[PDB]
Protein: Glutaminyl-peptide cyclotransferase
Organism: Ixodes scapularis
Amino acid sequence: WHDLKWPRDLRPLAHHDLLYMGQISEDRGDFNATLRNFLVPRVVGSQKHREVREFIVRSLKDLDWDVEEDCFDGQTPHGIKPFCNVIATLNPSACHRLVLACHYDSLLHKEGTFIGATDSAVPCAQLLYLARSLNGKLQNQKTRGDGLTLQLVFFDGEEAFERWSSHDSLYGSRHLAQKWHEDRTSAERLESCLERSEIANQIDRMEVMVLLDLLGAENPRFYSYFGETQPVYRRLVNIESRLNDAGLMELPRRRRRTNYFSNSSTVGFIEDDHIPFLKRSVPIVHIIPSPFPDVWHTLDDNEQNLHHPTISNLNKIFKAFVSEYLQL
Ligand SMILES: [Zn+2]
Ligand SMILES: [Zn+2]
Ligand SMILES: [Zn+2]
Ligand SMILES: [Zn+2]
Ligand SMILES: [Zn+2]
């Protein structure tokens, strides 16, 4: 009951695949094409928000993923609002899901039009970019019958309408967590669960949720925010280290290394889309910088303040991480 091992043995990415995940050569224009669709105000209930959702759904339906639009109405300080989570699953029958998540709504800012380029246009784009860039390998992985799949969740209504409170925020995530907790299931209904796993409902199928937010500014610092997922987090540290050793990271000068993923833990908690899951025992890795970028919730969280080299470096880490976890 001390030092419980991660339930899935984590096999290090082959040098071959590392070197391959780590050259985002000319991908580059493809990522930016994706991102431009998100660099618009995406306020809840707005037309542009509707359109971003349609772009997400279609991008993933086109890659033959199972896509569910989980729409519902909820009460806010601004009245009743329609919300719509997007849940995409590569192989719906697989018992276990590696879940990558972000929110696609943008903050309603008092002072003017807010783009939320790091929050979370970039993360949204990174999830679609991972799905597209790894499609070939994911489609092959899907037919192994090994009981693991990739699942992407684009939450709606993360942002508070007024002052952040338990009542005013995380509308999409609170809704989804409860729903999946109440929707009962078991191993016998599913494809190839791990041997002595305890599945009683849909939320138990989330093996780990990796939540991305506030990405795209220069030089983020990440820490392990949860002891529970330290074995998963350590894989990001190791991947980043291997990418630097292979000289595959974009840096301003030679003889520099990236050090985004600190090999320490931090004493800090961040009120976010992972919480209602945390209460239901879903292990969480929160990929969010500490401290937040300086542009956080300002009108300067915009396209021009994004840092291309950092974004391409993060993309390499994430592609390598998904490849290693799913053994692509
Ligand atoms: Zn003890
Ligand atoms: Zn629902
Ligand atoms: Zn925000
Ligand atoms: Zn956010
Ligand atoms: Zn957090």
